[PDB]
């Protein structure tokens, strides 16, 4: 009875409904997945093409937030872009102050606390996006973190966010990703994305792919065109039985 | 000014002279230079007297707040840290030179604190214009783990050296003995100087002064 | 009732509620008419005097912004005072910086930039709490010739050949549409303005009920004296 | 003041004199100029005592909080970077020459010089302070690659002793600290323990 | 995130002329643990009950009778964390007074400053009033002082009073037991008896906290002294 | 920065057919003392741009940090636009002039070398914000000792091959070693070409001392 | 309802109603079309006259020598955003002596317009923009929205009755890339004409054309410069 | 520099030389040192040319705004007070301005001296600049309130000419303006060489 | 100590004609006794009818020319028309006075066409005091060039000589000759001379070599 209007108000059950409504905004966006293998992290996004008038790569949901750190988002894209700017600022300030690349766990904690700061006040609105941060280094290994609108940050071996995240998580569970390399994970990621897409509900989609690992010398980058085409062909073949 | 302090086996002995000069003229013959910080921590002061009094009062107030909050006895390290951070932030403009001595749960501690914010943790320190004479006494005669009476005699000797060799020091010797079980504020501890005995009698008689006007207001 | 929504809330139709309400407020203002010809711009406003004891000369619904720019206002005149002061300051600033006269369009643009600078949060103290309740007709002569611009509280300003603002702006605008042709002379413009004002005014139109001013190439802003007003009105 | 640090395969050796002067008066003859910044990270300080003490306290605070946040032992380079940022930002207000030396799991033993002005450089060995000018030739002629911990300790002791004999602003005792993975070993050379070099007569 | 608080008052006048938020803060006070103050001829006693809800609580960890200076003591009835806020503020105000005047703050002056803070919270933007009542004791100029400060910011000087649960009955008991010329020991007995009237269950030396102010200053009673007094009763 | 502490001496730059070559010795002088003898005063900005600095080394390290971060940010954008050498030179001019106008200058003289779109770029920025382009450049005492030789060669031969440019830079470094009391005989040579930026060092000039017997 | 007044209030469905109402503000405006070939970017704006005696409202604005915009929605918000974009372009030319890349400008716009969607007492910008630009990556058409989302487009139309224009652009998008300047402008004009009422036709009074290109700085054609582009247009197919 | 002004029965006479120097080097011989603030106010330029020009242009802006707001022309005393208040905020910052504000308001002809040092005085005659002592000498001998208009013109021209004769920093041409009740008129601009031919010969 | 100014040399000259303006400058950039570069023009095209020549501290010259370009673009955006020469001069006066207490050490000469199509020259001092002239010289050799421009263009100190209007070709010859004479005696003037001619056809550029010492 009027308990769901501000993030500074608790419901009688102990819930903050504004944060839950932001989470609902995330649950309506399209699916992004991240998979952490033994030598890297691979991100795959199902980017829905709403208009054929759009260019390729418009409204991309994969970001480079640092040389070694990539970002996969779901939810309100403008919120996600502002959060990517926040993450870039955090990484750059860390390098300026402490003189080396920010560890992924520290960047995830900093951005998650920034996100949580928007769940306490009536003067602001919780972010309507969740995202994954992926990184690789020789010293720290491969790391994959996920942050939701409430500000909770967790490490994962595989993660899915968006409309079909439960089916995507089920598909991810069937993978022995701990011993796999980035090369075969990219195919597996493309297959999972093609599986969870609904052609009736959504007409067309581009498959955005990126990775970071020893394959890229610890640099997050878009997966090259050859590997992407091979992965798409393999996923399309797996769809047919 | 001569102020000094030593660590002896059971605690701290602080000492000071009691002369305050304005320029080259003695303004105060009995100046108190050993300042209360807390029931277990004291501080002798040299330099700008107003700066010393204000800084010690501020730190004493803050430490009282701290000890009320924690319910515990103050530490000398806390007083040292507060004093040095305050003095450093003022870049030497607050001219307080301090000998800070106390006994806490960790034992006796003695610090010298300089107006720019540097500190030294030492077993004996001197400060002020007579500091080199007192230091000479210390370097000649200090031994570790002295008894209380030995430490009192040594500190009084150092203050006396400052008094009899520095033009800016004089009058009485004041001591403050701090241990874990007691605090002795000996003021004066020694009186090595006294005013000379008067050989005559100045003419000072009723009616000597001529008066133009007079007004008497009765108080209720 | 009125504090349920903030001043910067959109309606479901994509309009700011407060701007729409200010637009409605302008329909309660007296009627002003601007006509732009090739020989100059004429502005005419109904004074709408309420009492015989009021001095009609104290009503100033037409003001000089600069020697070459005049302004007629409708709606809430007290709101128009600050906008007019801003327009005067901007013209003098432009003269100070560039040693030339500001164009009518740039003055109108500068005044229109203030229309939506209102809000409650994220503002300096004393900042505007609501939109202005005025509609302005700027009539001037610049290097592009004589021009007439309309500004409304939404911050939209438009060039106009002839326009009416105020309470009777619809019927007056329809009359303007039949009366106005491109090669109209300034005398014909003044006569047609006075005819339409006489048609829409509730009171009889004499030399004290109205203000009329013209800007012409080579002549400064000129407010018609009452003898000139009676010279024009004598044959209507 | 003379400060020195030398890297060896598994760690570092730091050394300092113990003299703090005010003019020609020795205000502290047993000064401790080797300051632990973290469990395996030390700084040697030269210049204004107030400035170096304040900056070392601030860097200790920042490095401790950073190490707690990261749940990771601090890098020597991170401490050197913090010192560099502080010394460069306030270069017009500070008189501080710092040596930052310590051990890392990722990098081993490390020596960094942050001289006045706030530049930062890694060196196989670094010297600093007013006395360091007198031993530049000695350390240039004496240093060799592959010295053990004991050779590094003896090298540092000899250089510091020579500087203390020549420089009026240096003297007292030699404070040494060997930092390796097992920990920190501190020692004081005083009296006849200080290396002796005969004065040339006749 | 936005650090701007509300700038409008949360305590306003009702049509009947009352500030209902202050009355609700008073209701919170009236639901608090009983507190008693008694001003004897040579000192003041402040006694409160602290009956923990379980034996798992460490009694010595938290205190309800608090020193403000060496000569001023505090106790409260109402909401404990509000009390901690006011204790911190009172200690800071006493220290600032000492810094300006170099003498310990008179009890009445400190009461006035604390009441001023409480009024500020009755009028300023975006805050509720404090939900505590304070009993303040002090010794000044060879004289004992006992004050009560309410959530509105009004303070009163008392010879003996009670706050919290059953405080009306406690006041009746006090006014039929209190007399002038009473000594500090007898005042301590009377304060413990007033607590006993509203106490539920057995009263032990750990169930209650007692502070005393006399010429020697203000101090909390150790549980051994309280046990001796309870044995005497 | 009114008082530079550790400073670098002259930096040389020279355009050639297909790229730019920059040279700088590896010395950080503390007043007259040669305190730091293995510091690089050349930085690689990106694949098309390199920078060399004379003057205060801490200010140069600060500029290296800021520029490196800007290049990282632009590469993060991933939109197919990268800073040209001309853009870097313009940004450096603005930064130096802003610091000068706050009376808090960065005490440096910078040479920016670059190769973009088949075109060589050589630019000078001093600490007052004076910036220009030239086919050859030399800061500090090099301006008096190396620039005349570079200019004489470019007078008789406007377009140099890479080999000729490198030889000329070696001769100038040798002259600077002979005649500049703040120089050192251990230097680096950075070349930017179509292939990118390559930094070679440490290097030494061949010196002759036979006039000591005259 | 209780969820449709503040931009900081999430609805139980995961939507923000004030942002959608600002979208409606954009949809109320007159149509405008933007398209690009390999070498040119063209904005064609259908201008609306408040009265028969008023000039048609300006729809195409200069931002920089290589960037222009067409606006739909609240005009004063569009002027705010245009001033911001001009200041960004001047900052880029001052600092780097290079024209600001178009996609970086669009990112700055998105960042600026996202902020008021999260802060209490603020409102979204009620303006949609078509941004025509040319830079090292060639021609660009961008669409910015009150939601602060932006789209890189082959072609786009916004404003009232823009769906018909979008259908026409869907049909001839394959043709657009190899068109010469006149043919590209004519494609844009036909798309804009598809949004007109039956009685109304494209005239030199209600058509404005902005063009940017490889060797062509951004240029606006309003009344008499539009006639060469209007000449040669076949009658509406119906 | 030599500028002078004096009141008399027929208004205000304002006269100036036209030379600007930079040390010993004559930068210009054609400086307009009588500033036409508006059709009813005149100012003079002595001290820093940029300072006088800038602050009297600011005065012109403020006077025009005053006329728009009040429907009356600002008075001479009010305008000079505005200028003095404007420059007082910069006292000790190095501004150098000595000017005469001249006009004709409801109080008759008005002449005010305003300087960057804060002085503001009404008067009948004033001379400002490096050559002002020579101008004072000639003007005082020749001045009366009851001069004819042509006599007043001749007196102003003669005083400026003698100043340029004695003062190294004065020269070029003499510009002469007459402030009358319905505004000022630019009377003449006579080269010092022609004046010399007319006075010596 | 730190001085925020340097003397970079260079000379700028402008001559206004009946239907043309000329702005000419030397191209030597120097500091102290050294030459930074021999190719550094001091003339900047502002509009198709307006050129500015700037001499003095080169850092200030670069900054001011960029500020002026920005302000011209802002004016075009705000007023939908290009700035005239007189408006540019008034704006430059305000810009230079905005730094009255930490001035641009720049001598500015604007050459252009007025609204009537006639040549116009405006000269400025470092704090923005400016006036219109028929001809003007600024920079290191200005005291060398100015008396000869007085003698030849102004016909000063000459008797029984008619005042024929200054044609474009005679003006070009005079500019070239006066700069050769300046290169003889002023150590800062040398290398090359860049001449910008502004007519209603537009702006034409020319380069004339000068001695390299």
UniProtKB/Swiss-Prot annotation, chain B:
Its EC number is 3.4.25.1. It catalyses: Cleavage of peptide bonds with very broad specificity. The keyword Cytoplasm applies. It is found in: Cytoplasm; Nucleus. GO terms for molecular function: threonine-type endopeptidase activity. The active site is at 1 (nucleophile). GO terms for biological process: proteolysis involved in protein catabolic process. The keyword Nucleus applies. GO terms for cellular component: cytoplasm; cytosol; nucleus; proteasome core complex; proteasome core complex, beta-subunit complex. Disulfide bonds: none annotated. It is an enzyme of class 3 (hydrolase). Keywords: Cytoplasm, Hydrolase, Nucleus, Protease, Proteasome, Threonine protease, Zymogen. The 26S proteasome consists of a 20S proteasome core and two 19S regulatory subunits. The 20S proteasome core is a barrel-shaped complex made of 28 subunits that are arranged in four stacked rings. The two outer rings are each formed by seven alpha subunits, and the two inner rings are formed by seven beta subunits. The proteolytic activity is exerted by three beta-subunits PSMB5, PSMB6 and PSMB7. Belongs to the peptidase T1B family. Component of the 20S core proteasome complex involved in the proteolytic degradation of most intracellular proteins. This complex plays numerous essential roles within the cell by associating with different regulatory particles. Associated with two 19S regulatory particles, forms the 26S proteasome and thus participates in the ATP-dependent degradation of ubiquitinated proteins. This is Proteasome subunit beta type-7. It comes from Bos taurus (Bovine).
From Swiss-Prot, chain D:
One of its GO terms (molecular function) is endopeptidase activity. Keywords: Acetylation, Cytoplasm, Hydrolase, Nucleus, Phosphoprotein, Protease, Proteasome, Threonine protease, Zymogen. Its EC number is 3.4.25.1. The keyword Protease applies. It catalyses: Cleavage of peptide bonds with very broad specificity. It is found in: Cytoplasm; Nucleus. The active site is at 1 (nucleophile). GO terms for cellular component: cytosol; nucleus; proteasome core complex; proteasome core complex, beta-subunit complex. GO terms for biological process: proteasome-mediated ubiquitin-dependent protein catabolic process. The modification Phosphothreonine is found at residue 35. Belongs to the peptidase T1B family. Component of the 20S core proteasome complex involved in the proteolytic degradation of most intracellular proteins. This complex plays numerous essential roles within the cell by associating with different regulatory particles. Associated with two 19S regulatory particles, forms the 26S proteasome and thus participates in the ATP-dependent degradation of ubiquitinated proteins. The 26S proteasome consists of a 20S proteasome core and two 19S regulatory subunits. The 20S proteasome core is a barrel-shaped complex made of 28 subunits that are arranged in four stacked rings. The two outer rings are each formed by seven alpha subunits, and the two inner rings are formed by seven beta subunits. The proteolytic activity is exerted by three beta-subunits PSMB5, PSMB6 and PSMB7. This is Proteasome subunit beta type-6. It comes from Bos taurus (Bovine).
UniProtKB/Swiss-Prot annotation, chain H:
It comes from the Eukaryota. Its main location: cytoplasm. One of its GO terms (biological process) is response to oxidative stress. It is found in: Cytoplasm; Nucleus. Keywords: Cytoplasm, Hydrolase, Nucleus, Protease, Proteasome, Threonine protease, Zymogen. GO terms for molecular function: endopeptidase activity; threonine-type endopeptidase activity. One of its GO terms (cellular component) is proteasome core complex. It catalyses: Cleavage of peptide bonds with very broad specificity. The keyword ATP-binding does not apply. Its EC number is 3.4.25.1. Bortezomib binds at residue 49. The active site is at residue 1. The keyword Protease applies. Component of the 20S core proteasome complex involved in the proteolytic degradation of most intracellular proteins. This complex plays numerous essential roles within the cell by associating with different regulatory particles. Associated with two 19S regulatory particles, forms the 26S proteasome and thus participates in the ATP-dependent degradation of ubiquitinated proteins. The 26S proteasome consists of a 20S proteasome core and two 19S regulatory subunits. The 20S proteasome core is a barrel-shaped complex made of 28 subunits that are arranged in four stacked rings. The two outer rings are each formed by seven alpha subunits, and the two inner rings are formed by seven beta subunits. The proteolytic activity is exerted by three beta-subunits PSMB5, PSMB6 and PSMB7. Directly interacts with POMP. Interacts with ABCB1 and TAP1. Belongs to the peptidase T1B family. This is Proteasome subunit beta type-5. It comes from Bos taurus (Bovine). The chain holds residues 60 to 260 of 263 of the full protein.
From Swiss-Prot, chain I:
PROSITE patterns: PROTEASOME_BETA_1, PROTEASOME_BETA_2. CDD domains: proteasome_beta_type_1. The modification Phosphoserine is found at residues 34, 40, 134. It is found in: Cytoplasm; Nucleus. Non-catalytic component of the 20S core proteasome complex involved in the proteolytic degradation of most intracellular proteins. This complex plays numerous essential roles within the cell by associating with different regulatory particles. Associated with two 19S regulatory particles, forms the 26S proteasome and thus participates in the ATP-dependent degradation of ubiquitinated proteins. PANTHER family: METALLOPROTEASE TLDD, PROTEASOME SUBUNIT BETA TYPE-1. This is Proteasome subunit beta type-1. It comes from Bos taurus. The lineage of its organism: Eukaryota, Metazoa, Chordata, Craniata, Vertebrata. The gene is PSMB1.
């Amino acid at each position: 009875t009027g308990y769901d209007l501000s993030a500074s108000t608790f419901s009688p059950d102990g819930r903050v409904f504004q944060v839950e409504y932001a989470m609902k905004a995330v649950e309506n966006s399209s699916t992004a997945i991240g998979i952490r293998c033994k030598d890297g992290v691979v991100f795959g996004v199902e980017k829905l093409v709403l208009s054929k008038l759009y260019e390729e790569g418009s409204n991309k949901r994969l970001f480079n937030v640092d040389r070694h750190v990539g970002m996969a988002v779901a939810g309100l894209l403008a919120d996600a872009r502002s959060l990517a700017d926040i993450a870039r600022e955090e990484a750059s300030n860390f390098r300026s102050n402490f003189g080396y690349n920010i560890p992924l766990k520290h960047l995830a904690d900093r951005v998650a606390m920034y996100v949580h700061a928007y769940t306490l006040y009536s003067a602001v609105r919780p972010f309507g996006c969740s995202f994954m941060l992926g990184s690789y280094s020789v010293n720290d290994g491969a790391q994959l973190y996920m942050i939701d609108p409430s500000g909770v940050s967790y490490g994962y071996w595989g993660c899915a966010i968006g409309k079909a995240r439960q089916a995507a998580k089920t598909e991810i569970e069937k993978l022995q990703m701990k011993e796999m390399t980035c090369r075969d994970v990219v195919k597996e990621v493309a297959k999972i994305i093609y599986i969870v897409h609904d052609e009736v509900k959504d007409k067309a989609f581009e498959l955005e792919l990126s990775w970071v690992g020893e394959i890229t010398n610890g640099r997050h980058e878009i997966v090259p065109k050859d590997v992407r085409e091979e992965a798409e062909k393999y996923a399309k073949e797996s769809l047919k039985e | 000014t001569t102020i000094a302090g030593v660590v002896y086996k059971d605690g701290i002995v602080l000492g000071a002279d009691t002369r305050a000069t304005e320029g080259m003229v003695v303004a105060d013959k009995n100046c108190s230079k050993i300042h209360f910080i807390s029931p277990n921590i004291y501080c002798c002061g040299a330099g700008t007297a107003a700066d010393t009094d204000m800084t010690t009062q501020l730190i004493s107030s803050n430490l009282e707040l701290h000890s009320l909050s924690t319910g515990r006895l103050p530490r000398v390290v806390t007083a040292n840290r507060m004093l040095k951070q305050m003095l450093f932030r003022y870049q030497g403009y607050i001219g307080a030179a301090l000998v800070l001595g106390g006994v806490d749960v960790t034992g006796p501690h003695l610090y010298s604190i300089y107006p720019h914010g540097s500190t030294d943790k030492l077993p004996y320190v001197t400060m002020g214009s007579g500091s080199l004479a007192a230091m000479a006494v210390f370097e000649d005669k200090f031994r570790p783990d002295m008894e209380e009476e030995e430490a009192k005699k040594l500190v009084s000797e150092a203050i006396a050296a400052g008094i009899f060799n520095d033009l800016g020091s004089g009058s009485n010797i004041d001591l403050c003995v701090i241990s874990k079980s007691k605090l002795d504020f000996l003021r004066p501890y020694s009186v090595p100087n006294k005013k000379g005995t008067r050989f005559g009698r100045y003419r000072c008689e009723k009616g000597t002064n001529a008066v133009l006007t007079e007004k008497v207001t009765t108080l209720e | 009732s009125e504090y349920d929504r903030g001043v910067n809330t959109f309606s479901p139709e994509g309009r700011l509620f407060q701007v729409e309400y200010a637009i409605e407020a302008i329909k309660l203002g007296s009627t002003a008419i601007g006509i732009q010809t090739s020989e100059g711009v004429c502005l005419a406003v109904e004074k709408r005097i309420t009492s015989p004891l009021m001095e009609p000369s104290s009503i100033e619904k037409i003001v000089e912004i600069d020697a070459h720019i005049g302004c007629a206002m409708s709606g809430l005149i007290a709101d128009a005072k600050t906008l007019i002061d801003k327009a005067r300051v901007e013209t003098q600033n432009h003269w100070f910086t560039y040693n030339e006269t500001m164009t009518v369009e740039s003055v109108t643009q500068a005044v229109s930039n203030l229309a939506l600078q209102f809000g409650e949060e994220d503002a300096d103290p004393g900042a505007m709490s609501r939109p202005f309740g005025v509609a302005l007709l700027f009539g001037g002569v610049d290097e592009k010739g004589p021009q007439l611009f309309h500004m409304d509280p939404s911050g939209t300003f438009v060039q106009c050949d002839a326009r009416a603002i105020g309470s009777a702006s619809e019927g007056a605008q329809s009359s303007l549409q039949e009366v106005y042709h491109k090669s109209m002379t300034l005398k014909e413009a003044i006569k047609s303005s006075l005819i339409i004002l006489k048609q829409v005014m509730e009171e009889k139109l004499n030399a004290t009920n109205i203000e009329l001013a013209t800007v012409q190439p080579g002549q400064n802003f000129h407010m018609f004296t009452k003898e000139e007003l009676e010279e024009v009105i004598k044959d209507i | 003041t003379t400060i020195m640090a030398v890297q060896f395969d598994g760690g570092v050796v730091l050394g300092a004199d113990s003299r703090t002067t005010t003019g020609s008066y020795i205000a502290n003859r047993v000064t401790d100029k080797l300051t632990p910044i973290h469990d395996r990270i030390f700084c040697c300080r030269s210049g204004s005592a107030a400035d170096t003490q304040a900056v070392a306290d601030a860097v200790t605070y920042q490095l401790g909080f950073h190490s707690i946040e990261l749940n990771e032992p601090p890098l020597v380079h991170t401490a050197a970077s913090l010192f560099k940022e502080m010394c460069y930002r306030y270069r017009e207000d500070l008189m501080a020459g710092i040596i930052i030396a310590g051990w890392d799991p990722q990098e081993g033993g490390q020596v960094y010089s942050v001289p006045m002005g706030g530049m930062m450089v890694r060196q196989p060995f670094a010297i600093g302070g007013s006395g360091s000018s007198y031993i530049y030739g000695y350390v240039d002629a004496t240093y060799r690659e592959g010295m053990t911990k004991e050779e590094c300790l003896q090298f540092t002791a000899n250089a510091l002793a020579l500087a203390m004999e020549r420089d009026g602003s240096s003297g007292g005792v030699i404070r040494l600290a060997a930092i390796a993975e097992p920990g920190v070993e501190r020692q004081v050379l005083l009296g006849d323990q200080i290396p002796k070099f005969t004065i040339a007569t006749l | 995130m936005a650090e701007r608080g509300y700038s409008f008052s949360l305590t306003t006048f009702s049509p009947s002329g009352k500030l209902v938020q202050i009355e609700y803060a008073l209701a919170a006070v009236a639901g608090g643990a009983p507190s008693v103050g008694i001003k004897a001829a040579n000192g003041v006693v402040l006694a409160t009950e602290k009956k923990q809800k379980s034996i798992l609580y460490d009694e010595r960890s938290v205190h309800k009778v608090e020193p403000i200076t060496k000569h001023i003591g505090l106790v409260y009835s109402g909401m404990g964390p509000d009390y901690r806020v006011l204790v911190h503020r009172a200690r800071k105000l006493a220290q600032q007074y000492y810094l300006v005047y170099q003498e310990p703050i008179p009890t009445a002056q400190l009461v006035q400053r604390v009441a001023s803070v409480m009024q500020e919270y009755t009028q300023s933007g975006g805050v509720r009033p404090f939900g505590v009542s304070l009993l303040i004791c002090g010794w000044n100029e060879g004289r004992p002082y006992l004050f009560q400060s309410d959530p509105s910011g009004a303070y009163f000087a008392w010879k003996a009073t009670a706050m919290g649960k059953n405080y009306v009955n406690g006041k009746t008991f006090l006014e039929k037991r209190y007399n002038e010329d009473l000594e500090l020991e007898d005042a301590i007995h009377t304060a413990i008896l007033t607590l006993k009237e509203s106490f539920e269950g057995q009263m032990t030396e750990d169930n209650i906290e007692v502070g005393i102010c006399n010429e020697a200053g203000f101090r909390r009673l150790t549980p051994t002294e309280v046990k001796d007094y309870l044995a005497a009763i | 920065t009114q008082n530079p502490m550790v400073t670098g001496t002259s930096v040389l730059g020279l355009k050639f057919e297909g790229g730019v070559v920059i040279a700088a010795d590896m010395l950080g002088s503390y007043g007259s003392l040669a305190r730091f003898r293995n510091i690089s005063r050349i930085m690689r900005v990106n694949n098309s741009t390199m920078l060399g600095a004379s003057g205060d080394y801490a200010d140069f390290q600060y500029l290296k940090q800021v520029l490196g971060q800007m290049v990282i940010d632009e590469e993060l954008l991933g939109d197919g636009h990268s800073y040209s050498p001309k853009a870097i030179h313009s940004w450096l001019t603005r930064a130096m002039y802003s610091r000068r106008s706050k009376m808090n200058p960065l005490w440096n003289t910078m040479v920016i070398g670059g190769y973009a779109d088949g075109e060589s770029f050589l630019g000078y920025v001093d600490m007052l914000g004076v910036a220009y382009e030239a086919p050859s450049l030399a800061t500090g005492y090099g301006a008096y000792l190396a620039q005349p030789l570079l200019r004489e060669v470019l007078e008789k031969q406007p377009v140099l091959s890479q080999t000729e440019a490198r030889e000329l830079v070696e001769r100038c470094m040798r002259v600077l070693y002979y005649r500049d009391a703040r120089s050192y005989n251990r230097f680096q040579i950075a070349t930017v070409t179509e292939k990118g930026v390559e930094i070679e060092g440490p290097l030494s000039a061949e010196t002759n001392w036979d006039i000591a017997h005259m | 309802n209780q969820y449709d007044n503040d931009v900081t209030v999430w609805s139980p469905q995961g939507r923000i109603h004030q942002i959608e109402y600002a979208m409606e503000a954009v949809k109320q405006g007159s149509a405008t079309v933007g398209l690009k070939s390999k070498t040119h970017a063209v904005l064609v704006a259908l201008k609306r006259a408040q009265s028969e005696l008023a000039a048609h409202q300006k729809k195409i604005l200069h931002v920089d020598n290589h960037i222009g915009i067409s606006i739909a929605g609240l005009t004063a918000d569009a002027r705010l955003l245009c001033n911001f974009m001009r200041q960004e372009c001047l900052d880029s030319r001052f600092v780097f002596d290079r024209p600001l890349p178009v996609s970086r400008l669009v990112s700055l716009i998105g960042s600026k317009t996202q902020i008021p969607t999260q802060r209490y007492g603020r409102r979204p910008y009620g303006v949609g923009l078509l941004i025509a630009g040319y830079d090292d990556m060639g021609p660009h058409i961008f669409q910015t929205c009150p939601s602060a989302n932006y789209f890189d487009c082959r072609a786009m139309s916004i404003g009232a009755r823009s769906q018909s224009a979008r259908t026409y652009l869907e049909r001839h998008m394959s043709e657009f890339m190899e068109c010469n300047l006149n043919e590209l402008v004519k494609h844009g004009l036909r798309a804009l004409r598809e949004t007109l009422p039956a009685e109304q036709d494209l005239t030199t009074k209600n058509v404005s054309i902005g063009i940017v290109g490889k060797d062509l700085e951004f240029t606006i054609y309003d009344d008499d410069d539009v006639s060469p582009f209007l000449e040669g247009l076949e009658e509406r197919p119906q | 520099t030599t500028t002078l002004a004096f009141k008399f029965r027929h208004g205000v006479i304002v006269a100036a030389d036209s030379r600007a120097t930079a040390g010993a080097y004559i930068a210009s011989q054609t400086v307009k040192k009588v500033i036409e603030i508006n059709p009813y106010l005149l100012g003079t330029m002595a001290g820093g040319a940029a300072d006088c020009s800038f602050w009297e242009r600011l005065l012109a802006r403020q006077c025009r705004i005053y006329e728009l707001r009040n429907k009356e022309r600002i008075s001479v005393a009010a305008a000079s007070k505005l200028l003095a208040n404007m420059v007082y905020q910069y006292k000790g910052m190095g501004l150098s301005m000595g000017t005469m504000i001249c006009g004709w308001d409801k109080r008759g002809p008005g002449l005010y001296y305003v300087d960057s040092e804060g002085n503001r005085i009404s008067g009948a005659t004033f001379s400002v600049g490096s050559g002002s002592v020579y101008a004072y000498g000639v003007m005082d001998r020749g001045y009366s309130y009851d001069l004819e208009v042509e006599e007043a013109y001749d007196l102003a021209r003669r005083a400026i000419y003698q100043a340029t004769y004695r003062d190294a920093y004065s020269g070029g041409s003499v510009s002469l303006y007459h402030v009358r009740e319905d505004g000022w008129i630019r009377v003449s601009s006579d080269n010092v060489a022609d004046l010399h031919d007319k006075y010596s010969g | 100590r730190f001085s925020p100014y340097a003397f970079n040399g260079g000379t700028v000259l402008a001559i206004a004609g009946e239907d043309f303006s000329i702005v000419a400058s030397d191209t030597r950039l120097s500091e102290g006794f050294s030459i930074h570069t021999r190719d550094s023009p001091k003339c900047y095209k502002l509009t198709d009818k307006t050129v500015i020549g700037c001499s003095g501290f080169h850092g200030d010259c670069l900054t001011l020319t960029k500020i002026i370009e920005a302000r011209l673009k802002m004016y075009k955006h705000s007023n939908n028309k290009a700035m005239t020469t007189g408006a540019i001069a008034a704006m430059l006066s305000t810009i230079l006075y905005s730094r009255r207490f930490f001035p641009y050490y720049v001598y500015n000469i604007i050459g252009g066409l007025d609204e009537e199509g006639k040549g116009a020259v405006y000269s400025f001092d470092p704090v923005g005091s400016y006036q219109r002239d028929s001809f003007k010289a600024g920079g290191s050799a200005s005291a060398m060039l100015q008396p000869l421009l007085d003698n030849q263009v102004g016909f000063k100190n000459m008797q029984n000589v008619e005042h024929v209007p200054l044609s474009l070709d005679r003006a070009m010859r005079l500019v070239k000759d006066v700069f050769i004479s300046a290169a003889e005696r002023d150590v800062y003037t040398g290398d090359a001379l860049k001449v910008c001619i502004v007519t209603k056809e537009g702006i034409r550029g020319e380069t004339v070599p000068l001695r390299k010492d």
